[PDB]
Amino acid sequence: DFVWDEEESEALRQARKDAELTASADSVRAYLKQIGKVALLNAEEEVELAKRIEAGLYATQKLAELAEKGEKLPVQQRRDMQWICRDGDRAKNHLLEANLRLVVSLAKRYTGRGMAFLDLIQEGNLGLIRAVEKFDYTKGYKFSTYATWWIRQAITRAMADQARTIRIPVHMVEVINKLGRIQRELLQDLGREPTPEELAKEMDITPEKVLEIQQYAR
Amino acid sequence: RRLRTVGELIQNQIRVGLSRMERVVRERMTTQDVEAITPQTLINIRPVVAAIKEFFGTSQLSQFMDQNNPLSG
Amino acid sequence: TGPGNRPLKSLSDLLKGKQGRFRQNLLGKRVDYSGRSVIVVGPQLKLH
Amino acid sequence: RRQPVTVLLKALGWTNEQIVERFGFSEIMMGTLEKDTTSGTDEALLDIYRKLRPGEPPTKESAQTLLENLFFK
């Protein structure tokens, strides 16, 4: 639909100001273009991929043993083993490719608290690497739901890590300091933690701005 | 131009402290049984005393008296 | 930015700022082996 | 930002007839009145509210009460 109220004008005013950084880490668009398109995989295909991955890992183990202790089988069989290890590597690559947009959709929930969207996406990707290393065809779960826990716990760990790339905007420090002072005063005089309505009353701003600014606090 | 003398200077800080105490009353008047609430249980004097102490301890206009000699004071 | 919501100082800031390396020598500084006192006329003194 | 003064007068409830009756003695006031793109009180109030509350949604009650809270309450 069509609306050009004052709120939309203010939103575009903000957008033009935010657009002054070209390759902003807060923008996933280039990352989405880099993902491309790979279809969502059903349970049978995912268990197939995991089976190939484990087979390739065991083939790598045996091939590493035979590369040292002699006892090498003729080259014709060694070539099939050399094929299995490559197949396992490819299976791991495909299984990771299948869930980058899952990582993105899990990361989008943590934006606005200090870390850039792409950094959260990298942490989620590493959580996904952790997931593929623990997945088990015996347990029978869908890989998406299983890896979701690993992605979210990795994102939380990075968020809850004392050393993080918190990159708060320059044009928010002053209002955050004012928020802190006013919340402190209201806590000291009201007898309890102030609800955002009281804060908005004191700061002369809409309450949802209070809830938005409070996300940057830590 | 006009002189904001000692009395008005103290009055302004009293006003600020009473403004804080007024918010205190606005809150704890609406968080207690209407039977139990009493004037003395609605009032917290600490903001007013703190404001007066702040004036007399930190305000640029409150100054150590120049006791060099009687004329200086 | 650090925990105080303030930016971290980088390598450039070592020499960029108003108290940077390039401006340290220029500003006045306190010196040892010096004193200060009120002056009076020594009319009996020689010029040296 | 600056505005024609009549934008305030209309916001306060003055009609063009009243403004002419009071300020008709001066030609610059009439020229300001006759070169103002405001029809009446509500439009003037909304125009004032836009400048006073940039980016916020304007409504009758908001502007009408805001102009009063500014100076008359």
Short mmCIF file of C-alpha atoms in Angstrom, two decimals:
data_model
loop_
_atom_site.label_atom_id
_atom_site.label_comp_id
_atom_site.label_asym_id
_atom_site.label_seq_id
_atom_site.Cartn_x
_atom_site.Cartn_y
_atom_site.Cartn_z
CA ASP A 1 0.00 0.00 0.00
CA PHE A 2 0.86 3.70 -0.23
CA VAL A 3 1.50 6.00 2.74
CA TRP A 4 3.81 9.02 3.08
CA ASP A 5 3.05 10.15 6.62
CA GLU A 6 5.61 12.04 8.69
CA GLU A 7 6.98 8.80 10.16
CA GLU A 8 7.99 7.51 6.72
CA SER A 9 9.69 10.82 5.95
CA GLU A 10 11.65 10.59 9.20
CA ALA A 11 12.55 6.97 8.41
CA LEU A 12 13.95 7.97 5.02
CA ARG A 13 15.79 10.87 6.67
CA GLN A 14 17.42 8.31 8.97
CA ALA A 15 18.12 5.90 6.10
CA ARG A 16 19.96 8.50 4.02
CA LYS A 17 22.12 9.29 7.06
CA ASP A 18 22.83 5.61 7.75
CA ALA A 19 23.74 5.03 4.08
CA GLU A 20 27.02 6.94 4.55
CA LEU A 21 28.89 3.66 5.15
CA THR A 22 29.19 1.54 2.00
CA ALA A 23 30.27 -1.96 3.07
CA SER A 24 28.54 -1.79 6.44
CA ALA A 25 28.80 -5.04 8.40
CA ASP A 26 25.17 -4.51 9.46
CA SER A 27 24.07 -5.32 5.88
CA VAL A 28 23.77 -8.99 4.90
CA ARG A 29 22.89 -8.26 1.26
CA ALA A 30 26.32 -9.06 -0.18
CA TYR A 31 26.54 -12.13 2.05
CA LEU A 32 23.14 -13.30 0.77
CA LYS A 33 24.32 -12.83 -2.82
CA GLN A 34 27.41 -14.89 -1.96
CA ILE A 35 25.29 -17.72 -0.53
CA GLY A 36 23.49 -18.09 -3.84
CA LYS A 37 20.76 -20.73 -3.87
CA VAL A 38 20.84 -24.31 -2.59
CA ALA A 39 17.64 -26.23 -1.96
CA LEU A 40 16.45 -27.27 1.48
CA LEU A 41 17.27 -30.93 2.16
CA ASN A 42 15.00 -33.57 3.68
CA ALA A 43 15.93 -35.97 6.46
CA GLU A 44 16.98 -38.81 4.14
CA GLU A 45 19.40 -36.62 2.17
CA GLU A 46 20.86 -35.14 5.37
CA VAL A 47 21.46 -38.58 6.87
CA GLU A 48 23.00 -39.60 3.54
CA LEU A 49 25.38 -36.64 3.79
CA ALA A 50 26.31 -37.49 7.38
CA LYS A 51 26.89 -41.12 6.41
CA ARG A 52 29.22 -40.01 3.61
CA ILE A 53 31.04 -37.65 6.00
CA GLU A 54 31.72 -40.37 8.57
CA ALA A 55 32.71 -42.85 5.85
CA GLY A 56 35.19 -40.33 4.45
CA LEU A 57 36.65 -39.65 7.89
CA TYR A 58 37.20 -43.37 8.51
CA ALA A 59 38.69 -43.73 5.03
CA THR A 60 41.06 -40.88 5.88
CA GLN A 61 42.07 -42.67 9.09
CA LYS A 62 42.82 -45.97 7.34
CA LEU A 63 44.57 -44.24 4.42
CA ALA A 64 46.76 -42.33 6.88
CA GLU A 65 47.67 -45.61 8.58
CA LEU A 66 48.50 -47.23 5.23
CA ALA A 67 50.52 -44.21 4.07
CA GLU A 68 53.02 -44.94 6.87
CA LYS A 69 52.98 -48.61 7.94
CA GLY A 70 53.28 -49.99 4.41
CA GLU A 71 50.87 -52.84 3.70
CA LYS A 72 49.52 -50.72 0.83
CA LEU A 73 46.93 -52.46 -1.30
CA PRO A 74 47.40 -52.24 -5.08
CA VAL A 75 46.86 -48.82 -6.62
CA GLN A 76 43.47 -49.76 -8.09
CA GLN A 77 41.89 -50.16 -4.63
CA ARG A 78 43.84 -47.20 -3.24
CA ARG A 79 42.20 -45.10 -5.97
CA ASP A 80 38.73 -46.00 -4.70
CA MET A 81 39.78 -45.08 -1.16
CA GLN A 82 41.16 -41.81 -2.57
CA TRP A 83 37.70 -41.29 -4.08
CA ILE A 84 35.91 -41.97 -0.77
CA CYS A 85 37.90 -39.34 1.12
CA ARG A 86 37.14 -36.71 -1.53
CA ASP A 87 33.47 -37.71 -1.42
CA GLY A 88 33.44 -37.18 2.34
CA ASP A 89 35.00 -33.73 1.99
CA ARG A 90 32.42 -32.77 -0.64
CA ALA A 91 29.59 -34.08 1.55
CA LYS A 92 30.76 -31.95 4.48
CA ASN A 93 30.97 -28.89 2.22
CA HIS A 94 27.45 -29.44 0.85
CA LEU A 95 25.95 -30.05 4.28
CA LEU A 96 27.44 -26.79 5.55
CA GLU A 97 26.29 -24.91 2.44
CA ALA A 98 22.73 -26.07 3.09
CA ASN A 99 22.27 -24.03 6.32
CA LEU A 100 23.89 -20.61 5.85
CA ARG A 101 20.47 -18.97 5.56
CA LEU A 102 19.47 -20.81 8.75
CA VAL A 103 22.46 -19.14 10.40
CA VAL A 104 21.27 -15.79 9.02
CA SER A 105 17.71 -16.26 10.27
CA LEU A 106 18.98 -17.21 13.72
CA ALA A 107 21.36 -14.23 13.82
CA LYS A 108 18.77 -11.64 12.78
CA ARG A 109 17.25 -11.87 16.28
CA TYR A 110 20.35 -10.51 18.07
CA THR A 111 20.92 -7.40 15.93
CA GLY A 112 20.89 -3.93 17.46
CA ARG A 113 22.68 -4.89 20.69
CA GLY A 114 26.21 -3.90 19.62
CA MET A 115 27.58 -6.57 17.29
CA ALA A 116 27.27 -6.28 13.53
CA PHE A 117 24.98 -8.69 11.70
CA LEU A 118 27.84 -10.28 9.75
CA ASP A 119 29.92 -10.89 12.90
CA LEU A 120 26.97 -12.64 14.53
CA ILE A 121 26.60 -14.61 11.29
CA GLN A 122 30.25 -15.68 11.51
CA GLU A 123 29.75 -16.85 15.09
CA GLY A 124 26.66 -18.77 14.00
CA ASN A 125 28.61 -20.30 11.11
CA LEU A 126 31.26 -21.54 13.53
CA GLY A 127 28.50 -22.94 15.72
CA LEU A 128 27.30 -24.76 12.61
CA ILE A 129 30.81 -26.16 12.06
CA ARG A 130 30.62 -27.39 15.66
CA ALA A 131 27.20 -28.90 14.91
CA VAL A 132 28.35 -30.91 11.88
CA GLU A 133 31.21 -32.31 13.99
CA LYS A 134 28.75 -33.76 16.55
CA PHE A 135 25.83 -34.79 14.31
CA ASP A 136 24.87 -38.47 14.44
CA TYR A 137 22.75 -40.53 12.06
CA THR A 138 21.95 -42.82 15.01
CA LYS A 139 19.98 -40.12 16.84
CA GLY A 140 17.78 -39.48 13.79
CA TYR A 141 17.08 -35.77 14.32
CA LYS A 142 16.56 -33.23 11.59
CA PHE A 143 19.89 -31.45 11.23
CA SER A 144 18.29 -27.99 11.20
CA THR A 145 16.70 -28.25 14.66
CA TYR A 146 19.78 -29.97 16.11
CA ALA A 147 22.20 -27.38 14.71
CA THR A 148 19.93 -24.54 15.84
CA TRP A 149 20.97 -25.12 19.45
CA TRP A 150 24.65 -24.99 18.49
CA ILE A 151 24.21 -21.84 16.40
CA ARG A 152 22.29 -20.01 19.13
CA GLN A 153 24.60 -21.12 21.95
CA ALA A 154 27.64 -20.02 19.93
CA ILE A 155 25.99 -16.65 19.28
CA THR A 156 25.18 -16.29 22.99
CA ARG A 157 28.72 -17.28 23.98
CA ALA A 158 30.17 -14.64 21.66
CA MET A 159 27.64 -12.12 22.97
CA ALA A 160 28.35 -13.10 26.59
CA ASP A 161 32.12 -13.12 26.03
CA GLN A 162 33.85 -10.31 27.90
CA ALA A 163 36.08 -9.60 24.88
CA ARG A 164 33.78 -8.74 21.97
CA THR A 165 33.69 -6.31 19.05
CA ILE A 166 31.05 -4.01 20.51
CA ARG A 167 30.87 -1.11 18.08
CA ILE A 168 28.19 1.22 19.49
CA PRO A 169 27.30 4.26 17.34
CA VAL A 170 28.82 7.67 18.04
CA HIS A 171 25.39 9.35 17.84
CA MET A 172 23.93 7.28 20.72
CA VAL A 173 26.42 7.77 23.58
CA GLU A 174 24.93 11.02 24.90
CA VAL A 175 21.34 9.78 25.03
CA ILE A 176 22.52 6.52 26.62
CA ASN A 177 24.29 8.52 29.34
CA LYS A 178 21.13 10.56 29.87
CA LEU A 179 19.09 7.34 30.06
CA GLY A 180 21.48 5.94 32.65
CA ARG A 181 21.34 9.06 34.81
CA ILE A 182 17.55 9.31 34.65
CA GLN A 183 17.06 5.60 35.36
CA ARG A 184 19.42 5.89 38.33
CA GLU A 185 17.51 8.86 39.73
CA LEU A 186 14.14 7.18 39.21
CA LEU A 187 15.38 3.99 40.86
CA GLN A 188 16.69 5.94 43.85
CA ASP A 189 13.47 7.93 44.35
CA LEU A 190 10.69 5.59 43.15
CA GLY A 191 11.81 2.64 45.29
CA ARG A 192 11.85 0.23 42.32
CA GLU A 193 13.25 -0.17 38.83
CA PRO A 194 11.42 2.25 36.50
CA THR A 195 9.20 0.92 33.74
CA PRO A 196 9.94 2.38 30.27
CA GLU A 197 6.79 4.52 30.51
CA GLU A 198 8.26 6.54 33.39
CA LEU A 199 11.57 6.85 31.55
CA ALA A 200 9.79 8.11 28.43
CA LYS A 201 7.90 10.57 30.62
CA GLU A 202 11.19 11.95 31.95
CA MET A 203 13.21 11.95 28.70
CA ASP A 204 10.44 13.40 26.48
CA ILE A 205 10.67 10.53 23.97
CA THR A 206 8.35 7.76 22.86
CA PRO A 207 8.64 4.63 25.06
CA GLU A 208 9.69 2.31 22.22
CA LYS A 209 12.73 4.56 21.85
CA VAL A 210 13.44 3.76 25.50
CA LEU A 211 13.23 0.04 24.76
CA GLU A 212 15.46 0.50 21.70
CA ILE A 213 18.13 2.52 23.52
CA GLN A 214 18.17 0.10 26.45
CA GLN A 215 19.37 -2.69 24.13
CA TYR A 216 22.75 -0.95 23.76
CA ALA A 217 23.25 -0.93 27.54
CA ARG A 218 25.49 -3.57 29.10
CA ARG B 1 19.14 43.23 36.06
CA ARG B 2 18.17 41.96 39.51
CA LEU B 3 19.78 40.38 42.56
CA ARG B 4 19.07 36.71 43.23
CA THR B 5 19.98 37.01 46.90
CA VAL B 6 20.74 34.31 49.47
CA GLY B 7 17.10 33.62 50.25
CA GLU B 8 16.07 33.04 46.63
CA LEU B 9 19.21 30.98 45.97
CA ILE B 10 18.30 28.65 48.84
CA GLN B 11 14.64 28.68 47.76
CA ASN B 12 15.46 27.36 44.28
CA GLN B 13 17.31 24.34 45.67
CA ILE B 14 14.51 23.75 48.17
CA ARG B 15 12.19 23.76 45.15
CA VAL B 16 14.29 21.14 43.36
CA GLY B 17 14.40 18.90 46.42
CA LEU B 18 10.66 19.24 46.96
CA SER B 19 10.18 18.36 43.29
CA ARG B 20 12.04 15.09 43.90
CA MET B 21 10.04 14.40 47.06
CA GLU B 22 6.87 15.10 45.06
CA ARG B 23 7.67 12.23 42.70
CA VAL B 24 8.36 10.06 45.74
CA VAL B 25 4.86 10.89 47.00
CA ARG B 26 3.32 10.30 43.57
CA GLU B 27 4.73 6.77 43.68
CA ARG B 28 4.33 5.51 47.24
CA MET B 29 0.87 7.08 47.50
CA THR B 30 -0.28 4.69 44.74
CA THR B 31 1.47 1.56 46.08
CA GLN B 32 -0.10 1.20 49.56
CA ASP B 33 -3.47 0.43 51.09
CA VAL B 34 -5.56 3.59 51.33
CA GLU B 35 -6.21 2.66 54.97
CA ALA B 36 -2.53 2.39 55.92
CA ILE B 37 -1.20 5.44 54.05
CA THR B 38 -0.43 8.41 56.29
CA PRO B 39 1.28 11.75 55.56
CA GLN B 40 4.49 10.70 57.33
CA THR B 41 4.66 7.43 55.37
CA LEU B 42 4.25 9.22 52.02
CA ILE B 43 7.17 11.63 52.51
CA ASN B 44 10.88 10.96 52.06
CA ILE B 45 12.91 13.94 53.24
CA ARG B 46 16.24 12.67 51.90
CA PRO B 47 16.05 14.44 48.49
CA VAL B 48 15.41 17.81 50.17
CA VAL B 49 18.23 17.43 52.70
CA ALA B 50 20.53 16.22 49.92
CA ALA B 51 19.69 19.26 47.78
CA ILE B 52 20.32 21.69 50.65
CA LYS B 53 23.60 19.97 51.51
CA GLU B 54 24.60 20.05 47.84
CA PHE B 55 23.94 23.79 47.69
CA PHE B 56 25.91 24.59 50.83
CA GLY B 57 28.78 22.25 49.92
CA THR B 58 29.21 22.62 46.16
CA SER B 59 27.49 25.74 44.78
CA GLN B 60 29.87 28.31 43.32
CA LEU B 61 27.93 31.03 45.17
CA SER B 62 28.55 29.41 48.57
CA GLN B 63 32.10 30.49 49.41
CA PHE B 64 34.51 30.37 52.32
CA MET B 65 34.26 33.81 53.89
CA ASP B 66 37.29 36.06 53.38
CA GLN B 67 38.37 36.32 57.02
CA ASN B 68 41.63 38.12 56.20
CA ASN B 69 40.30 41.13 58.12
CA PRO B 70 36.91 42.56 59.10
CA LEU B 71 36.63 44.73 55.98
CA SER B 72 37.29 41.77 53.69
CA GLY B 73 34.45 39.78 55.25
CA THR C 1 34.16 0.86 21.92
CA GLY C 2 35.03 -0.35 25.40
CA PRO C 3 32.72 -1.12 28.32
CA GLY C 4 32.22 2.60 28.95
CA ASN C 5 30.72 3.00 25.46
CA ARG C 6 33.83 4.98 24.47
CA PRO C 7 36.16 4.23 21.53
CA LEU C 8 39.44 2.42 22.13
CA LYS C 9 42.64 4.35 21.53
CA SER C 10 44.52 3.06 18.48
CA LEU C 11 48.13 3.31 17.32
CA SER C 12 47.47 6.54 15.42
CA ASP C 13 46.13 8.21 18.56
CA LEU C 14 49.63 7.88 20.04
CA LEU C 15 50.76 10.68 17.72
CA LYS C 16 47.48 12.21 16.52
CA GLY C 17 46.07 13.95 19.57
CA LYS C 18 46.59 17.26 21.33
CA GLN C 19 48.86 15.32 23.72
CA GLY C 20 50.43 13.32 20.90
CA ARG C 21 54.11 12.62 20.41
CA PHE C 22 54.61 15.40 17.85
CA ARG C 23 53.26 18.06 20.26
CA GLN C 24 54.94 16.91 23.50
CA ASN C 25 58.10 18.99 23.14
CA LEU C 26 56.31 22.11 21.90
CA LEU C 27 54.25 22.70 25.04
CA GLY C 28 55.76 24.29 28.12
CA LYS C 29 57.07 21.96 30.80
CA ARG C 30 58.30 22.13 34.39
CA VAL C 31 62.07 22.06 34.88
CA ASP C 32 64.32 21.12 37.80
CA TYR C 33 67.07 23.29 39.32
CA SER C 34 64.80 26.35 39.23
CA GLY C 35 63.22 28.71 41.73
CA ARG C 36 61.11 31.85 41.89
CA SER C 37 61.05 34.83 44.24
CA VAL C 38 60.08 38.47 44.60
CA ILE C 39 62.60 41.06 43.39
CA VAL C 40 64.00 44.20 45.02
CA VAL C 41 66.46 46.80 43.77
CA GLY C 42 70.10 45.99 44.45
CA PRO C 43 71.54 49.45 43.74
CA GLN C 44 75.01 48.50 45.04
CA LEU C 45 75.37 45.62 42.57
CA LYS C 46 77.50 45.71 39.45
CA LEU C 47 75.75 45.19 36.13
CA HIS C 48 76.93 41.56 35.94
CA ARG D 1 12.26 27.62 12.52
CA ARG D 2 10.71 31.00 11.76
CA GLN D 3 7.07 31.33 10.72
CA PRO D 4 4.71 34.17 9.82
CA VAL D 5 3.40 35.58 13.07
CA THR D 6 -0.22 35.13 12.00
CA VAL D 7 0.34 31.36 12.08
CA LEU D 8 0.50 31.79 15.86
CA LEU D 9 -2.51 34.12 15.98
CA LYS D 10 -4.65 31.65 14.04
CA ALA D 11 -3.35 28.86 16.29
CA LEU D 12 -4.58 30.92 19.25
CA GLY D 13 -8.10 31.19 17.82
CA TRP D 14 -7.99 34.44 15.83
CA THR D 15 -9.88 34.70 12.55
CA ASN D 16 -8.76 36.89 9.67
CA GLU D 17 -11.47 39.41 10.57
CA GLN D 18 -10.14 39.74 14.12
CA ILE D 19 -6.53 40.07 12.94
CA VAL D 20 -7.57 42.75 10.45
CA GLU D 21 -9.55 44.60 13.13
CA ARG D 22 -6.67 44.59 15.63
CA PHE D 23 -3.60 44.97 13.38
CA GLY D 24 -5.14 46.70 10.35
CA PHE D 25 -3.35 49.95 11.23
CA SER D 26 -0.05 48.62 9.81
CA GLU D 27 0.42 47.55 6.20
CA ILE D 28 3.23 45.08 6.93
CA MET D 29 0.98 43.06 9.26
CA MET D 30 -1.71 42.95 6.56
CA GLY D 31 0.86 41.90 3.98
CA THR D 32 2.01 39.10 6.28
CA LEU D 33 -1.61 38.04 6.82
CA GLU D 34 -2.45 38.15 3.11
CA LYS D 35 0.70 36.15 2.22
CA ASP D 36 0.22 33.25 4.63
CA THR D 37 -0.76 29.77 3.41
CA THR D 38 -2.88 28.97 6.49
CA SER D 39 -6.67 28.87 6.52
CA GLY D 40 -7.59 28.60 10.19
CA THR D 41 -6.86 27.44 13.70
CA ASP D 42 -6.57 23.69 13.10
CA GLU D 43 -4.25 24.00 10.10
CA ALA D 44 -2.06 26.51 11.94
CA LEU D 45 -1.90 24.24 14.99
CA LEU D 46 -0.90 21.24 12.87
CA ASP D 47 1.77 23.30 11.08
CA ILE D 48 3.17 24.43 14.45
CA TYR D 49 3.11 20.85 15.74
CA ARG D 50 5.14 19.60 12.78
CA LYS D 51 7.97 22.00 13.60
CA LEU D 52 7.61 21.36 17.34
CA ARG D 53 7.50 17.54 17.04
CA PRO D 54 9.44 16.62 13.88
CA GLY D 55 8.83 13.08 12.68
CA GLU D 56 5.89 12.43 15.03
CA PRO D 57 2.29 11.89 13.88
CA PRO D 58 0.19 15.06 14.21
CA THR D 59 -3.37 15.10 15.56
CA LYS D 60 -5.84 17.71 16.80
CA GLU D 61 -5.49 16.93 20.51
CA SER D 62 -1.70 16.68 20.40
CA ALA D 63 -1.15 20.10 18.82
CA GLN D 64 -3.96 21.85 20.69
CA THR D 65 -2.69 20.67 24.08
CA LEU D 66 0.98 21.15 23.17
CA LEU D 67 0.56 24.83 22.33
CA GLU D 68 -1.21 25.32 25.67
CA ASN D 69 1.40 23.38 27.65
CA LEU D 70 4.12 25.51 26.05
CA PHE D 71 3.04 28.88 27.42
CA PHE D 72 -0.37 28.88 29.15
CA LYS D 73 -0.23 26.00 31.67
#
